[PDB]
Amino acid sequence: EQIVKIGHASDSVRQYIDGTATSGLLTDYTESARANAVAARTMRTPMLKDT
Amino acid sequence: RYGGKKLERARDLFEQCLENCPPTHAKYIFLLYAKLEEEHGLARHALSIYNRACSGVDRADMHSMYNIYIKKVQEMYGIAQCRPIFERAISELPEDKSRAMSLRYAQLETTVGEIDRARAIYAHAAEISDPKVHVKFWDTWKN
Amino acid sequence: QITAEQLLREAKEREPDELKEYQRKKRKEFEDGIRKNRMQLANWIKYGKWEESIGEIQRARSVFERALDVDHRSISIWLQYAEMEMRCKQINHARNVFDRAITIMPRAMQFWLKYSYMEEVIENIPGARQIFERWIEWEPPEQAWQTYINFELRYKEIDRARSVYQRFLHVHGINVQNWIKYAKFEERNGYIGNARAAYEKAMEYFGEEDINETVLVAFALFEERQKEHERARGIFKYGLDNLPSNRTEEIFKHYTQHEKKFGERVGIEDVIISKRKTQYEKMVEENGYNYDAWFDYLRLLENEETDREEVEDVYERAIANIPPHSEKRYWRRYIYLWINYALYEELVAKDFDRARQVYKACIDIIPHKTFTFAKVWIMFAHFEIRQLDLNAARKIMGVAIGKCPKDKLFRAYIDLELQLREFDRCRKLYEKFLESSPESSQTWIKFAELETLLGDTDRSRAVFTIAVQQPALDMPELLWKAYIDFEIACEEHEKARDLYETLLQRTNHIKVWISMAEFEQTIGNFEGARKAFERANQSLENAEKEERLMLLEAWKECETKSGDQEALKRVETM
Amino acid sequence: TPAGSVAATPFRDQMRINEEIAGSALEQKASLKRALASLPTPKNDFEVWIEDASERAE
């Protein structure tokens, strides 16, 4: 619930506005978040804590 | 003739129908009844029809009612709220479709990131999946 | 396997006077089996049957008589003793055997059935009647009287079968089904006046205070099937009028069958509504927290234009189901009971004083410290903007800010003060809003937007000047975006240049440097863009070529716009 | 298991613009108050279907 609350706010304030030259200050956040999510998609359980 | 303008009377027809409908014929009536409640009714009523449909329809087509309920919950409340009705499916539909549901459920939990839950889906399906013939299951788990 | 079953078990799967002397050997066998083991009653039946098979009927009789001395309560012995007599056509012997059996064990139905059946098959049907009559003198089970009824009906003796029912209800009248079966019998033989009287007597018998639904339903469906539909409707309505609604579900479903065929639309819908109200009222008592039962029930009563006092009362019952949790998730569905109650009171009842009390009672119920609904505060504020009481709406909305600063509460109050054209008020509210969440860079835009909307170009510059000084914004790029946009739009391009380079002191991000050069392209001062690229060339030499490549080719884009054949090699040699 | 990479979807302040230093909240809030106390004051504004069983009944 908290994650989607932050996500919808951050998405909205991106798609809110574009621009003709000064838009290069902004990131296209949602696509960068998708890029970050697929990078974080590789994860593994740790081994050797005991045996 | 009436659409939603006589809906509480329309409900009484569908309830009167389904109160005696057999389970070989009820498939179309449940989907027709859900369409009424979908377009005019409250949301949980349509979902309660599907929850009835995936047990009132006979075993040979019960998977085709579960995946409707999966799709429609997922379409509005997303994959998080979708979890409990996969677990009903896996526990209830016949073993060939219970594998298929287990593969689909594990795909969600991996695409979410509940890797520990994904294993327990596979490990629970793996006891009804002979590796000498169902090789495509063990491939998906091996991958 | 080797052996364990498919051999070790399987290998053990497998491994004239001479008639007269045979009779003597058999009696030696039977009679000493008796001496060895009386109460082995099967030996006595076999011995008695065997003497019959040898034609020694008189011997066979005595053997059964000796068996009965050992167990006179064995129904098998009496029946086998009876059957062997009637196999031998010894009908007067068989009659005496049955009279003894039914005399000694009057409760064993098998003797009465077999005896009366024998006397029927033998066509002594007044003998069969007297057997059934003697049976009924023991006031036997219900199944006994049915066989006497069926006996009389098979001879088409309807008035006889009627008399058995009228005696049958004197004994087993307590079972309603016996009473309905009689009226079905009178009906099926066309004695419809007797069938009606039978149902009317049923109601009388079971008592018209302790009313029985099964008689009412059966009686009503009878009159329906006799086309006495105004009586059928009468019986259903009398049932609903006189019985508690925890029963009557059968009366209802059959009434909304009868009326749904033989009634008419205004009647059909009236009974279905009353069914549904009863149905919601039940499933509310089953749970209370079944809010969807309330939302339907309230909608139904509103849709049918039911009287205000009853719609208002049911809302009060809905409202008492306060969620047992301090967590907003459970209230999100619940709270529309309150909102709909106020909407009903304001729109439908048009009693605004009562509507105010609804909204007030919301705020006394929501915890506010743990969570708040901005919904109710906004609605209650706008309800006091209606009725032209902004001095109350401001008090309501200011306490919302006071108890629980929340972004939609600020936004909605600010928007209200803008619509009122109270520019002083919303300025003060924005200052409180930014104090409440100074990181909310988006709101710094909307504060500065207001200043630009009022045309105070000095006000807006100061806000932005303060905004970019504030640490830890949500996203400074969106603030710098808006400020460069503003600084361009007021034609202060020399300050916009100053503003752009005073961003660059905090970042060397490649796309900002591209946008800095691109800004100079839009000015038409492409020489400013060129040295922006040359600055991004001859000062970021430590930047990796795979990152620089995006910016070196941005100058290439600038020079393919420019067409300078000599500049391309300048782009090429870097 | 440290999974749950869905939480990697929200993020903020990606561009390096924030100074990453701030005061204690009260004096930080006082700095905001006493700065925003410098905002100028003046302004100007103007801002000027058919039913035959029923049909034959009625």
Ligand SMILES: O=P(O)(O)O[C@H]1[C@H](OP(=O)(O)O)[C@@H](OP(=O)(O)O)[C@H](OP(=O)(O)O)[C@@H](OP(=O)(O)O)[C@H]1OP(=O)(O)O
């Ligand atoms: O307080 P905010 O951060 O501005 O978020 C609010 C708030 O959300 P939460 O209070 O649940 O966090 C509203 O909820 P209420 O205060 O009215 O209970 C919600 O309204 P809903 O609960 O009906 O979704 C509304 O969303 P919306 O803008 O769709 O009305 C949304 O406002 P923002 O989207 O403007 O942040």
